[PDB]
Design a protein around this ligand. Sequence first.
Ligand code: KC2
Ligand SMILES: CC1=C(C#C/C(C)=C/C=C/C(C)=C/C=C/C=C(C)/C=C/C=C(C)/C=C/[C@@]23O[C@]2(C)C[C@@H](O)CC3(C)C)C(C)(C)C[C@H](O)C1
Ligand SMILES: CC1=C(C#C/C(C)=C/C=C/C(C)=C/C=C/C=C(C)/C=C/C=C(C)/C=C/[C@@]23O[C@]2(C)C[C@@H](O)CC3(C)C)C(C)(C)C[C@H](O)C1
Ligand SMILES: CC1=C(C/C=C(\C)CCC[C@H](C)CCC[C@H](C)CCCC(C)C)C(=O)c2ccccc2C1=O
Ligand code: SF4
Ligand code: SF4
Lengths: 665, 86, 55, 177, 99, 184
Amino acid sequence: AIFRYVNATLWSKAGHFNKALSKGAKTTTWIWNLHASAHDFDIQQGSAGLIARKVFSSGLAHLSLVFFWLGGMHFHGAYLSNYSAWLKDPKSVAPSSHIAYSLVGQDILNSYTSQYFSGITITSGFFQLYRSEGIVTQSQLKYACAASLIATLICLSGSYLHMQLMSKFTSFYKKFQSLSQSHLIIMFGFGSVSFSAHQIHEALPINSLLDSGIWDPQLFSAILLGTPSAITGKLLNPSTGSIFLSQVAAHHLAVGIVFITLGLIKWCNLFFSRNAILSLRLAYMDYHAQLSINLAVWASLSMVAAHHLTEIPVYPYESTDYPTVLCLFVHHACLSGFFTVASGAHASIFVIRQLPTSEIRHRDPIIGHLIWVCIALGLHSFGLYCHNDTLEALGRPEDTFCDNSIQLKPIFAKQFLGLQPGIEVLDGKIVRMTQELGTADFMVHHIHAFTIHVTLLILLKGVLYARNSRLVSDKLELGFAYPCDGPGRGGTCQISPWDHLFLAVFWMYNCLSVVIFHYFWKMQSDVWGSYVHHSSLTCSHYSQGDFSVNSITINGWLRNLLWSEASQVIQSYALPSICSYGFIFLAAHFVWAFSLMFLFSGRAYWQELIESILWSHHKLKIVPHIQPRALSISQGRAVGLTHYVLGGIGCTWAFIISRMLVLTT
Amino acid sequence: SHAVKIYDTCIGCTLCVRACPTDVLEMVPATVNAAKQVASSPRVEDCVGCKRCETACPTDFLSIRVYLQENEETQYSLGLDLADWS
Amino acid sequence: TYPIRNEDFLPIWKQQQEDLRAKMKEYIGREFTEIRWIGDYDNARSPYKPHNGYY
Amino acid sequence: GGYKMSPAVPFLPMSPALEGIPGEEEGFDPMGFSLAIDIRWLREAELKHGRVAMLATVGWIATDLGLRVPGEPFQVSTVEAHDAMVKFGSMPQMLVWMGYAELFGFLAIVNMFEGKTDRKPGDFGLRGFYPQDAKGQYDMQVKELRNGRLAMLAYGGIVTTAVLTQEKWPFFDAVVN
Amino acid sequence: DERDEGLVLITPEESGKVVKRDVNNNPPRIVMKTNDWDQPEIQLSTGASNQINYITPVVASDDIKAWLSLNVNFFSILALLTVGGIIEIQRFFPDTLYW
Amino acid sequence: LRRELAIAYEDSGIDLLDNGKFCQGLAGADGAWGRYEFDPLGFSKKTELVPYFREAELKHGRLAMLAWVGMVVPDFVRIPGEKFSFEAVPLPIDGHDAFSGATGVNAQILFWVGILEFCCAKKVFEWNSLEVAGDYGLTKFFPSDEEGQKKMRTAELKNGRLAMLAFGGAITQAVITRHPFPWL
Ligand code: KC2
Ligand SMILES: CC1=C(C#C/C(C)=C/C=C/C(C)=C/C=C/C=C(C)/C=C/C=C(C)/C=C/[C@@]23O[C@]2(C)C[C@@H](O)CC3(C)C)C(C)(C)C[C@H](O)C1
Ligand SMILES: CC1=C(C#C/C(C)=C/C=C/C(C)=C/C=C/C=C(C)/C=C/C=C(C)/C=C/[C@@]23O[C@]2(C)C[C@@H](O)CC3(C)C)C(C)(C)C[C@H](O)C1
Ligand SMILES: CC1=C(C/C=C(\C)CCC[C@H](C)CCC[C@H](C)CCCC(C)C)C(=O)c2ccccc2C1=O
Ligand code: SF4
Ligand code: SF4
């Protein structure tokens, strides 16, 4: 409440928050520690009330940042986009709300999207989102941008205010029953009901008119009008290739009602098995416990979103916008992986800072059986691929695991939609087609399970052995993020939960790369493509259905997926559309290789090299009084991990997007 | 086992002894420094080689040195728990 | 060869959309006019004299 | 006698920040903005708005009545004059000059807040037709404030009604129903 | 502190014992030490009050100049100006036709 | 008696102790022949919010008193305008839909009401107390006696509650019957 204590005097102190940074700038390690501990509000000077203040205000500031980003997206759609051309004819014109300058010949990046527009094709599905929302006018998009900017300002003001409104007595953030009830009834229930209302009152008429072909201003400014009795999802909009928006609105109304009912039964105490969860309720009333749980929840929801946004079509024309659906799936899968490893990290932090649950007292059997299942899964799943490779090379296809040869049928992969026979098409494209599972799907799914289990093994080992282990018994005293305990006892490198995350991130990236490749190749070979004429169509797929024949071997993956489908990105230099993607492919390769420097080398070599270099500076009287230092061990690991993941993700990003853009245009 | 040696640069601040995880070191009377004590390493057989003494040593270069000897590894220096060589 | 799922509905869907088009055409009473992406239209219920036709 | 009540809103107590300042005779601040923001900043912003709005009102009235400066590029209506002159190049140069003047105004505000100079909120040192007596100075400041407030409201009405009815400044021959 | 001049600031021990009104006619305010560096003291009201409580922060040009003198802002501004200069040179004299 | 708001605001704010009276001794709990302390659900047990409850009650009563008369008068007479004529709008219940949206006729009313409420929120929250609940200084015609002031406050509250129920009755009957005043 007292705002006289907020002054810019501390802005120039640069390290006031951390007491360990009091002896300001004796080395560059001080700068690095400042950055590393900037947002670690728990270990910073102050009190628990201040920690809560910072957490909540930072959440609000990030909310404002996201609102600013959304407002920028809306502004770009309104003023720097071909949304008008896309709306009138989505198929011919690729979405593009992105324009580049003509600085150094950089105008080559802009590619033909419409007669009067040239730019970069966007892959976020924002045009389809606008169409679903009923936004069909520049004025509507402009007012959406204005609302987003106003929300940004409001959130910024809220953060600034709450930095002082909340005092040491503040306890509203500890009212978990009130928090959960409010979020469940208002944020989710009422939110879903209100969005169903919005759909019914605005989007349904506009979308129906757009499907018909009407573009009249008076009409733009009778539910279930066109939807038959067919089950939702069993019949897609013939003119749009997506679930009926009236069905979506009914879904949101039902979901809001269900959430309100759940909240009300919780309010009335109808739920009875409180004791089964009371232990968790007492244990996990912590910042890091809640952060870990929420991160895992949102990771799983992001993965489900990645799957459903493609398998179940709900946005107009997103089904046929192949780059959009692919990019959405890949982006949300990557976010799922990142937030899962985050949940592991903050579980470890909670274990370090608070008392763990009693399942940590038989941790040896848990991790031992997880190790065994990881080993067995990896052996069988990957050795089937290796067996296929070796036997096929020897010239014995009859001995390999494939549909024609020994076949591993996925008996448990059974249908549940009960769809009618055939496929759904929309203007020379396959909006929806059943995925037929065989030996290749069996093998790839078990590879997925293996990688998921190994990542889980790393995270769980880090969590359970955070406090102590047979090797070192004072890991709790060591803390959360330390490089080692020493060269002793054989060597205690990377025994910390921080390093366990540092490895689990590598494994999550490996898992997600395999998942991305599986989705990409399977969709290209067996789902996406065009058709050539009760009528029967012969479907010409982009990859020509080679997944089921070539995916059974690692050589097939290397040749038919990486080498064969890298033709677009590798040969993209002359092409105006994707030359940027080719350059980013090259640069991401460079960055990934550059990460190996930090991942393989060690601190001492660089410190000694720095001292030898500094000899010459001292000789010439160039004396830096912030004495240069080699990056700490943990920082070197972090830098290597960041560059490695960024380079790999960039290579995959450019490769897939170039392929999709060229194929669809 | 490892070799833990102490040099006369020692000032007897006891930080090595306090940082010892398996109590290998102990302060002993001396006249070399003003503190009138120098760390010793009688129980070097228990030294694991963590170099926490070395980390805690203040002197410009360490007055206590732990030389690792991987060829002479014992169960005490390896911190063996599940297996017993005794 | 893959048959097209729900073939029978496509003629029905075309008939429904054409019927709705005719219904709205009759309701308005004039030919549909393409909306302008950058254009500005007066509200049909505005109390001031029209500047640009509200349709 | 209890609190000192606002003459504008008799059922609310006068904000102590707006005592001794010109315009305290009304004492209008029911929302309590003077209890949250510095009255110096509030009055500086009020005077800037009043002066800018007076100039804008007179300019809009003049352009609507006619009186366009010689030249072809200026043969546009007041509503579209903003965009026309932005394309022409007048508005960017005017904005550069505004940035210069506002840099000096910002320096004035900063120095006033830091106390380096005993500068009143809106004072820039201009003394033209300014009465010598203190009562006259107070009356002239109140006159400035009231004319500026009237000009703010008048410009809001003028711009809104012009955009709505597409009529000239008087709007008297406009149709509303 | 000029903000609270003329205010009756009673310690928690004197709450309710002192009822003298302020210069602004407000009731006395209870002052408490919180032991927080960010908010060392907090004030509670004994009743309805009509007083100025600025929500704007106290920022000094000297503090802003020190913050910009921080090496980060200095070198970021230097690098931004350099990058802008190179970009504008590329714009004005493309392809190095002179060379 | 009623003191000037300036003096009354001297002792204002959320009281913590409780005068031991029904609803802190506020007016409006008085039967025709005796005392009628109506609070079956015990809302007045929140003595700190009692002033807020009285302010809200008086606001609702005044608003509904205006609303009932505004549902009665339009059918008998209308503003001399083409869009307010009986042909454009047959019954008052149609006014909301007729004047909602781009027409702005009701938007202006909403805007001015919002401005007034924004200006009165300071009294509603800060300067609310048992004695100044619903008192905006508009005390013209207010009797200069304790008994007269109490009786006038009781009459205001009773008429406000009667109109509070009567507006619900009239609006519901009008929507059900689509008929003139008598059924509203
Ligand atoms: C607990 C049982 C109970 C029930 C079930 C019940 C039901 C109804 C019904 C519906 C069936 C109506 C429509 C109705 C109406 C009124 N009741 Mg009533 N009432 C009950 C109890 C009391 C008491 C104790 C008093 C009272 C009064 C009034 C007044 C007078 C207002 C005035 O003029 O002040 C009016 C209009 C007060 C009074 O003085 O009545 C002469 C009064 O003291 N009621 N009452
Ligand atoms: C909105 C509306 C209407 C209206 C209206 C209304 C009420 C309009 C009001 C307009 C208003 C109130 C306009 C004031 C301008 C004042 C100016 C320009 C003062 C300049 C003053 C200057 C330039 C002074 C300069 C100096 O002081 C300086 C800086 C220092 C010293 O050297 C002294 C001098 C003198 C040199 C209609 C028409 C009624 C109906 C229509 O339908 C809608
Ligand atoms: C017309 C319209 C609109 C509308 C509307 C509006 C404004 C609607 C307003 C509705 C309103 C205001 C409805 C009140 C109901 C009151 C009830 C039910 C009271 C019951 C009371 C009961 C059951 C009992 C009371 C008592 O027992 C108590 C408690 C104690 C006893 O001593 C005395 C008695 C027995 C009496 C839109 C949305 C604006 C536009 C749209 O186009 C259509
Ligand atoms: C290279 C390396 C160093 C030396 C690296 C250092 C000191 C980093 C240098 C930091 C610079 C000064 C930061 C400034 C950023 C770059 C210079 C930006 C270049 C951008 C280009 C596009 C021009 C370590 O210290 C280290 C420590 C532990 C494990 C591995 C390693 C390791 O691999
Ligand atoms: S070995 Fe190091 S820490 Fe131990 S007494 Fe000697 S100088 Fe001190
Ligand atoms: S290396 Fe470790 S165990 Fe060995 S003496 Fe030093 S501190 Fe003790």
